[PDB]
């Protein structure tokens, strides 16, 4: 009658509890509170399916409120303190004439209501007219390569992190800006953060996948360390062995040492008062 689906750790029946997280790579527009210099925001939780698991979230904001003269659209890009106007991003991606940049946001030129909302943003970006002058507006030669790298590595790392896909990211940026101005016009309804379809559960497998990755990488750093010390085997199994064992025994996931930061009660001693329990 024993169904299984749990572990025996140091002679103790441990159960891995499913973890409810918000889905990633998901485009979501939300409205800001009454005292805010931003009225609406487009958010994207861009992460690699497998590849460290990117914590980088892009915010596309609509500065100014309803009734505030000239509303500007800026976006926060990972590892650059200020939120730069979207027109500069487009120029830094390759799209230089404002009207090719317009064509990337508005998919209809019979939609003046949306285009009029873009007019001040075009004016903001107008200071910078070239791609190299846009990469520079990411603080020379040093600040230009730095910029080049961020847009490839940290800006929208899902889709691709490769190279030439500059167009793909530009259309996507425009899609986000379209979905932003869409709730700004009150044409689309504000995204629901509690729609169960826009959530995910992390069971035994992915919780172990997270844990393992960290532990393996910690042995890789020891393998590299022994190699340096070898001024001319060494693989400590313990790091993986006890590493996994501690996370599953303590339930305090983390696991590095551990500490207070991270964890919970992820692994739990399996209930056995009655069968149904």
């Amino acid at each position: 009658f024993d169904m299984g689906g749990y572990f025996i750790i140091n002679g103790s029946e441990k159960v891995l509890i499913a973890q409810e997280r918000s889905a990633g790579n998901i485009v979501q527009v939300f409205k800001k509170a009454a005292p805010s210099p931003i009225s609406h925001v487009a958010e994207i939780r861009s992460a690699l399916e497998k590849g460290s698991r990117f914590i980088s979230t892009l915010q596309v904001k609509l500065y100014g409120r309803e009734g505030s003269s000239a509303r500007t659209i800026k976006a926060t890009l990972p590892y650059i303190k200020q939120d730069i106007p979207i027109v500069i991003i487009f120029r830094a991606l390759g799209i230089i004439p404002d009207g090719e940049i317009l064509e990337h946001i508005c998919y209809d030129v019979n939609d003046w209501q949306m285009l009029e909302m873009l007019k001040p943003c075009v004016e903001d970006g107008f200071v910078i007219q070239d791609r190299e002058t846009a990469l520079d507006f990411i603080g020379k030669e040093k600040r230009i390569q730095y910029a080049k790298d961020i847009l490839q590595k940290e800006f929208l790392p899902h889709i691709t992190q490769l190279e030439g896909f500059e167009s793909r990211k530009a259309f996507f940026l425009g899609y986000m800006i379209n979905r932003l101005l869409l709730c700004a016009l009150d044409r689309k309804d504000q995204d629901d953060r509690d729609h169960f379809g826009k959530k995910r559960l992390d069971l035994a497998g992915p919780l172990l996948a997270q844990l393992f990755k960290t532990l393996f990488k910690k042995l890789t750093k020891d393998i590299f360390r022994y190699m340096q010390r070898t001024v001319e085997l060494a693989i400590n199994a313990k790091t993986i062995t006890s590493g996994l064992k501690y996370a599953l025994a303590t339930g305090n996931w983390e696991q590095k040492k551990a500490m207070s930061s991270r964890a919970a009660g992820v692994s739990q001693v399996l209930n056995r008062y009655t069968y149904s329990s």
Binding site: K50, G51, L203, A204, G205, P206, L208, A209, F212, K213, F216, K217, T220, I223, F224, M227
Partner: peptide
Amino acid sequence: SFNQFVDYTLQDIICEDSTLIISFGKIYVT
């Protein structure tokens, strides 16, 4: 979930970052 991890995901982790100045191959589970 666990079966998926053991079968696929486990081979993935040992092969994505892996390789050092020494490279990693097929994972085996007793």
